[PDB]
Amino acid sequence: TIARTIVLQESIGKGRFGEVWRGKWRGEEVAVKIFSSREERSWFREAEIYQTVMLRHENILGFIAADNKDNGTWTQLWLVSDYHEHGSLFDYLNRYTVTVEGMIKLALSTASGLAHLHMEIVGTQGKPAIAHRDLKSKNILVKKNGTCCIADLGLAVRHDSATDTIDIAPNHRVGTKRYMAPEVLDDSINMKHFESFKRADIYAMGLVFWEIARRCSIGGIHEDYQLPYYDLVPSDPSVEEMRKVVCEQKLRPNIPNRWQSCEALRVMAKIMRECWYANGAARLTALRIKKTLSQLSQQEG
Ligand SMILES: c1ccc(-c2n[nH]cc2-c2ccnc3ccccc23)nc1
C-alpha cells in the first residue's frame, strides 16, 4: 500500500550502495532508497536496524517504511524515509560555510544523535545499544532547521545486553577506510566487546567535527572544505595507506592555531583531540560530548 502509492520524482544522490530518489507520498516529499538486487545483502539489514529498535530521535533519520516490491517483472526493494532537501552534511559543508552558531548546532545534533544510537535502555520496551561503524560526513544529513540526523545505518551493530552478545550484520563490506579508527586500521580492535565499536564511532565523529569547524567562518576567515587526511592520503585510500598515517606516523588532522581565538572553536578543538586518542578507552563518550556542546549552546543562545 506504501511503495505502491509513492511516485518517484528525482535522483537525490548515489550511495556506493543503491542510490536515492526524492518521491511524493500523499502530497509530501519523501526519500526512497532502492536496492540494486545484489545489494539486498543490506536491504533487510538496514530495514531491520531502522525497525527492530526503538530508534525514534530527532537526530536520526526518521524511518517511514520497507516494502518488498520485487516486481512481477523485476527486483524492487524499497526503503522509505523522511526527505531532507539540503542532503548530506558533506554536500552542505562543500557548498556553504557556517556561523559559530551553525557549527555548534551541527556538532551538537550529531552528538545527541549518536548518543541516542549508543544508549541502551534495558527492560520491557527497551532499546539495544547501537554502534554505526560507518560514521562520516556523507552519512549524516542536515535538516531544514540547521540540525543533523544520522543516516545510512546499514552497517550498524546491535548489542544484546541480556546475553552480552552482538547481533552481527549480514554483509560483505566493512566501512569507509578514511574514517576507520586506529584499532580498526591495525586490526587490534576486540570486535567481541561492544564498547570498542562505540569508541570507534567516536574517533570518526571527531573527524566530522574537524570538517565542520574548518567551515565556521568568522571575520570572513575559514578554510576550504576538505576531507580528513586530504593532505596525507589519496582519494579512496587503502587500509595500508591509512594505517601508516594514522597508526605508524601517529598523525591526526591539523588543528589551526587560530581555532583558539574563539571559545566555541576552542571547545570543538578540545573535543576533537579527545576523540582521536589511539586508545579508545581514553576517548570522550557521545553523551559527554553532547553535554559540553549543550552547555556551550545555551551560553551562545
Ligand atoms: C531511505 C531513503 C533515503 C535514505 C538515505 N540514505 N542516505 C541518505 C539518505 C537520505 C535520507 C533523507 N533525505 C535525503 C535527502 C537528500 C539526500 C539523501 C537523503 N535511506 C533510507
What is the compact description of this entry?
The protein is α+β, with helices and mostly antiparallel strands.
Explain how this protein is built.
There is one protein chain. The chain is α+β, with helices and mostly antiparallel strands. It folds into two domains: 85 residues, Phosphorylase Kinase, domain 1 (2-Layer Sandwich), CATH 3.30.200.20; 216 residues, Transferase(Phosphotransferase) domain 1 (Transferase(Phosphotransferase), domain 1, Orthogonal Bundle). The strands form three sheets. Strands 1-2-3-5-4 form a five-stranded antiparallel β-sheet. A three-stranded antiparallel β-sheet has the order 6-9-10. Bound molecules: 4-(3-pyridin-2-yl-1H-pyrazol-4-yl)quinoline (PY1). This is TGF-beta receptor type-1. Belongs to the protein kinase superfamily. TKL Ser/Thr protein kinase family. TGFB receptor subfamily. Its cofactor is Mg(2+); Mn(2+).
N-to-C SSE string, H for helix and E for strand: EEEHEEHHEEEEEHHHHH
Shape: globular
Number of domain units: 2
Largest sheet: 5 strands, antiparallel
Query: Which CATH architecture of the largest domain?
Result: Orthogonal Bundle
Tell me the total number of β-strands: 10
Strand % is 15-25%
CATH topology of the largest domain: Transferase(Phosphotransferase), domain 1
Q: Would you identify the CATH H-level superfamily of the largest domain?
A: Transferase(Phosphotransferase) domain 1
The radius of gyration is: 19 Å
> What is the CATH C level class of the largest domain, in words?
Mainly Alpha
The largest beta-sheet arranges its strands as: 1-2-3-5-4
Structural class: alpha+beta
Number of helices: 8
Helix content: 25-40%
Bound molecules: 4-(3-pyridin-2-yl-1H-pyrazol-4-yl)quinoline
Distance between the termini: 44 Å
Cross-link (Glycyl lysine isopeptide (Lys-Gly) (interchain with G-Cter in SUMO)): 192
EC number: 2.7.11.30
Cofactor: Mg(2+); Mn(2+)
Cytoplasmic side: 1-301
